[PDB]
Amino acid sequence: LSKMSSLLERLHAKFWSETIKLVRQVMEKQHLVSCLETLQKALKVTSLPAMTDRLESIARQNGLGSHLSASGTECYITSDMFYVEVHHGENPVSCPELVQQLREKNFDEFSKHLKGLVNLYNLPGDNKLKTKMYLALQSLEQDLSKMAIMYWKATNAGPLDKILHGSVGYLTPRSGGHLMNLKYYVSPSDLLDDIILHENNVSRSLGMNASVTIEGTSAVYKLPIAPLIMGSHPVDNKWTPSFNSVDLPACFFLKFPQPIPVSRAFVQKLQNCTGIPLFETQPTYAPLYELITQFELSKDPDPIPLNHNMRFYAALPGQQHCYFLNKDAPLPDGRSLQGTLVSKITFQHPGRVPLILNLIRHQVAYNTLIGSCVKRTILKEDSPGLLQFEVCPLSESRFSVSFQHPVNDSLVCVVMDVQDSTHVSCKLYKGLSDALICTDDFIAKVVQRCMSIPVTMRAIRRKAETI
Amino acid sequence: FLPLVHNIIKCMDKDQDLNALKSKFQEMRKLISTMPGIHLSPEQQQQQLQSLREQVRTKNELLQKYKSLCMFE
């Protein structure tokens, strides 16, 4: 709260023109003591020799065997991260995958990918798994690219029904400035270019995408050490039979960002494809929708308190509205909704997993899209509208929406089950004496394609209402 | 200056007179900066320059208006 240590007392407590004899008479003698040399990025711009010197300093401090002829160029001591832009395993690679993103002045993919792969490819193995198994898993991670190309060739209609939704196939190359990924999110009703307008496949970098990783500690499962199955399969794809197979100390542990709530049936079905289930811990069987809505809307949420308390009031096409969530409500099913509040994504070798992941992905996507209507709208005591509805998840992926239909003097529910991955069932149940306020399969498929609770509410209030 | 601090660190942790050269360069830079001429801050200088430009424009317009309307005999 003062500035008396800059020019008033700084130069007076430094213990001129002829008092610079401190280079040879008083010289008889980078983390938290010497910040001058550590702040090379602030004194000078990020250049070739500056980064090469910083890398060498970090290697000498933390401990990493690496050197060169002189200062001005430095490689990366790893399995295959050795690449000099502009031999103990693989040869010197100069592919564009690690030259495009870091061409001229990039400074992001220089201390995260390297450190990431170093932390991942680190274990108690001494020259037996730190390098051998790492290279084996890196080489084995190439059949998916051939499988991706085969899926792209087979699905020559559009990259919307096979790449993102339905099944896997929206993959990209995992090298340098881009790691392995997949189409986890499948939000089709986002802000599009007004089925994205692209020349070729997306590298899962333009916008938002998940992050798939390959690491493990005790999941030493039998897997190949080289790509064998590479021929074009009959219709969609073919498996790769291994076992030339050793106990490779690695796995396919991805990075699940949010604890998406799933069903017990999906986890039980997936618990028979890759050994054990997708999580080994105490299952947090708490209200699934309650925590899932907060986890999903937590991105946009600001530091201001919300305090919804199971209130799902939201807006409308031209007014305000309201809704519920039926959270923490034990249905006739008996036990409450199973919760999967965990971040363990420790998978196993790519065995019979052609649909072991896509089903749970579609389930989680439908669950998210259900609570999509409540993201940041906070408006209570709305006398007008207030199309309150309670999604009753009695069965797995089975929702219901109640609306004050003018047909009868009561609410109007409709069974909303996710039959397909994007074509959900939107049937409805009317009354013995009720007007035809129930739309046809046209509006049902429209709402299915929309997959938004607020969209359905607006449709009921505008199209189905007709009043 | 980044180069001055770099030379100082080099001369300090190399085991020449980088400090003398740095001081000479700093004195030369200070002399070149003071060579401009504007002793006071450039804020009032720019204010006075804008005022003088406005006054010159007004005087030119007045002279033009005076030398234009010449219809007497």
């Binding site: 700084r10 003591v33 | 601090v5 700093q26 401009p36």
Partner: peptide
Amino acid sequence: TRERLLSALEDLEVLSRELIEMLAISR
């Protein structure tokens, strides 16, 4: 702009001397 420039030069020289002393006492 003479006083401000001289003060800036003096502060820069003091900072450089402090940095050199820290580099000599640390490394």
